[PDB]
Design a protein around this nucleic acid. Sequence first.
DNA 1: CCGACAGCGCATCAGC
DNA 2: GCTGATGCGC
DNA 3: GTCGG
Length: 326
Amino acid sequence: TLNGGITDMLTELANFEKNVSQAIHKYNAYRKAASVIAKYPHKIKSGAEAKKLPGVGTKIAEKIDEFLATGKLRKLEKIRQDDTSSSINFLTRVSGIGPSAARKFVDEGIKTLEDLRKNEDKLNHHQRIGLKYFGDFEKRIPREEMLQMQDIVLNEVKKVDSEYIATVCGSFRRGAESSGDMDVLLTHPSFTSESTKQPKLLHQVVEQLQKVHFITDTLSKGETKFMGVCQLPSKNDEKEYPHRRIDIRLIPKDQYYCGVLYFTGSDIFNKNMRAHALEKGFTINKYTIRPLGVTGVAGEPLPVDSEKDIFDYIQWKYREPKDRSE
DNA sequence: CCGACAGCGCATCAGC
DNA sequence: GCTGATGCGC
DNA sequence: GTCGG
Ligand code: NA
Ligand code: NA
């Protein structure tokens, strides 16, 4: 309400940079501007005011001046009207159709879901699945269903092998009221850094979840990452739930908690902890925390047996996932 | 004035 | 057949 | 597009 007109503007501009211009850094640029503006607790009155925010520069300030004085942005209006650009932008909403496939399709007259349905032979497997669940995938997942999806995932994982450790991360683990998908982090004691993976630890879990008909489709699957589709069993009385996106990553046990830390987020929080970790003389990524020598050389990964272990290393009090908004 | 902006697993394409 | 590049999603 | 070396 404060600046929703501005952030919608910037978001639309962002999508067009990503899907049509293929300028991924401009996409993140506009997105970064939209975020910071979303958090500014004042109704912006001028481009110059906005420019004071980190991530808002000259150009976006000019655009805000124009939107403020007129209620629209000329570039955006033109783009909206544009047949090619809007079709290209629309097709990328299909999972598996990126900017390049979307451009190709539109070049050959394929520009609607209907056109996609009429040329299914020109779609790979991932795209067909995305096409199939176009509507369901754009739906959000209420926490209540996320909790009914977790039960299922934790139950069947333990059913396969009770030494398995599984953690539903993402914004769900931070307490969020809804989710966009489900991100599962999987480990097993038999799988470590310098070790075997019994190259079937992941497959086994994916198989069992297919068995009880939770996982309904597969977008991709290897020895360490599964990307797929799942669906809560329908009540017997009422509407069947929409199909959801689920990812499952098998991680080495000695890297599990760094992984859980990282995929729990949030992104802002990961930025801070890693920045703090550096100032404290540690380097933190997805996999490990390592000490930094005097000449800047990273030593071997330190032992980690919980999220808290990491916090202790960099001398900060353990923060609850609920409190990692930033 | 100009390069960074995250980077990696998996599917599939390009090319040998 | 293979390796390496690209597209994609996260 | 924005930031910063
Ligand atoms: Na700024
Ligand atoms: Na897409």
